Design a binder for these strands. Structure first.
Ligand SMILES: [Mg+2]
Ligand SMILES: [Mg+2]
Ligand SMILES: [Zn+2]
Length: 461
RNA sequence: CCAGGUCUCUCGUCCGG
RNA sequence: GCCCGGACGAGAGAC
């Protein structure tokens, strides 16, 4: 994905849009109790901890476009993935304006607590003003759509989130693209019934984990995979995608019944953004923040992966591929072992930078013991070996607990980390409750007992 | 006084059948 | 006791 230009937006009659200049993350009651190497992310160029040109670091990810042409391997990939989806019987009609705004089975309402994007952002206009959950009124949304139409530009923001040291020093903050409310509504009428089907069908048919619950889904996964695993992450996913893959997606969409709205994918593939004072244009790259981000990412991942198998392993039977993706994050399997270092190598050709799922340096043989998906390991219970624990490392839970965006949230936050930690077992969960209680405010919280969590888990089956 | 997207899951608070 | 739904908030995870 590549940047086509940049100019003060004044010079094209777009407003200047300046976001906050401070992190909302303050150190936690438990800041010294537990340890961590993570600090809040760079939000502005004038950030002391910076050891590089910020704005060159944030846009650094647009590494350009390798391919533009759907080659023969991508086509068979497209052919195979789409045939898979065909079995889901995905209703291919537009979704009515009411359900696109307000939600329906498989599709949540629009988040009323996030902004309406351009132009509303610059008019001091909010989704709340426009949307009414109680009435489900589409009248005013229709007016605005009539008035401002679609394909509006996306307002760029740096995510306020925790970040490692190298990433605070190399100014590697993550960038989100504020989709316009008009385009979310438009995107969801076109595609609501597709999003819905994906949400309802986590697993190896969709090749997507969107809609899953790790506490319950970890027990499904090993039974769904083939005998040997391989797994991946990608460096800069959204921004590493060339238009070739977007065409491939368009072709998939056409094949399953969405031919008429495949043009929405071009607005994704060639997009315009507003960032502080500038205004820029990108070709290729996923505008992370647009409706469908997760679905389209995960769908493309399924294409990418089929492609490389076809190109690296002649006579590979894709009907024995079993893979689950969450955006770039993927765990995959095949009846016989495959070499992720080779697949990755071929990957390099289509513009992809592929890694082990943990962003380790070198690929290892992937086993039910080392594999990770969404950061969690897999660990059979000791009493019931068919039930599998999603095991998130305490290291991650330690990082989280050390900060707060608001201290009035400590009960919920810390309680929520308990529902992740106890999968590390009683001995480690109980040591956790120790440290939390090693200070006054901890002893204020209502934390659940290992046995309560264990009984809920088992009962939940 | 507020600025920061698209989502999934879970927890919590409150209100319903 | 067991469901089912609603509104708000929070954490985690993907981008
Ligand atoms: Mg990535
Ligand atoms: Mg990932
Ligand atoms: Zn242009």
């Amino acid at each position: 994905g590549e940047i086509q230009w940049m100019r003060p937006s004044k010079e094209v009659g777009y407003p200047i849009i300046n976001a906050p200049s401070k992190t909302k993350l303050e150190p936690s009651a438990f800041h010294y109790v537990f340890e961590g190497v993570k600090e809040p992310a760079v939000l502005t160029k004038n950030d002391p901890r910076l050891k590089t040109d910020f704005e060159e670091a944030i846009f650094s990810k647009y590494v350009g476009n390798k391919i533009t042409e759907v080659d023969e391997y991508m086509k068979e990939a497209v052919d195979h993935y789409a045939g898979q989806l065909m079995s889901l019987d995905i209703n291919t009609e537009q979704m009515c304006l009411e359900d696109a705004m307000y939600g329906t089975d498989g599709l949540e309402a629009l988040d009323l607590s996030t902004s309406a994007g351009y132009p509303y952002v610059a008019m001091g206009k909010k989704k709340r003003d426009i949307l009414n959950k109680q009435t489900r009124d589409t009248k005013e949304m229709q007016k605005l759509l009539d008035t401002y139409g679609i394909n509006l530009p996306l307002v760029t923001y740096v995510k306020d989130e925790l970040r490692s040291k190298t990433k605070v020093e190399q100014g590697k903050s993550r960038l989100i693209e504020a989709s316009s409310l008009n385009d979310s509504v438009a995107m969801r009428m076109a595609f609501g019934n597709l999003y819905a089907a994906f949400h309802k069908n986590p697993g190896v048919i969709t090749g997507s984990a969107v809609g899953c619950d790790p506490d319950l889904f970890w027990s499904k996964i090993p039974v769904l995979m083939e005998e040997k695993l391989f797994a991946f992450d990608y460096t800069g996913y959204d921004a590493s995608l060339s238009p070739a893959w977007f065409e491939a997606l368009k072709m998939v969409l056409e094949k399953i019944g969405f031919g008429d709205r495949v043009d929405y994918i071009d607005y994704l593939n060639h997009s315009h953004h507003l960032y502080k004072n500038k205004t820029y244009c990108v070709k290729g790259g996923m505008p992370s923040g647009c409706s469908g981000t997760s679905i389209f990412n995960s769908m493309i991942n399924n294409l990418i992966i089929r492609t490389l198998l076809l190109k690296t392993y002649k006579g590979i039977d894709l009907d024995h591929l079993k893979m689950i993706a969450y955006g770039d994050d993927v765990i995959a399997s095949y009846p016989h072992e495959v070499d992720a270092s080779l697949l990755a190598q071929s990957g390099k050709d289509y513009g992809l930078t592929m890694t082990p799922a943990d962003k380790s340096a070198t690929f290892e043989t992937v086993t039910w013991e080392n594999v990770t998906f969404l950061k969690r390991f897999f660990r059979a219970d000791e009493k019931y070996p068919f039930l599998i624990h999603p095991v998130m490392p305490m290291k991650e839970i330690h990082e989280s607990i050390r900060w707060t965006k608001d201290p009035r949230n400590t009960q919920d936050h810390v309680r929520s980390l308990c529902l992740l930690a106890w999968h590390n077992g009683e001995e480690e969960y109980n040591k956790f409750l120790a440290k939390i209680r090693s200070v006054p405010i901890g002893r204020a919280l209502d934390l659940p007992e290992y046995s309560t969590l264990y009984r809920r888990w088992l009962d939940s089956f």
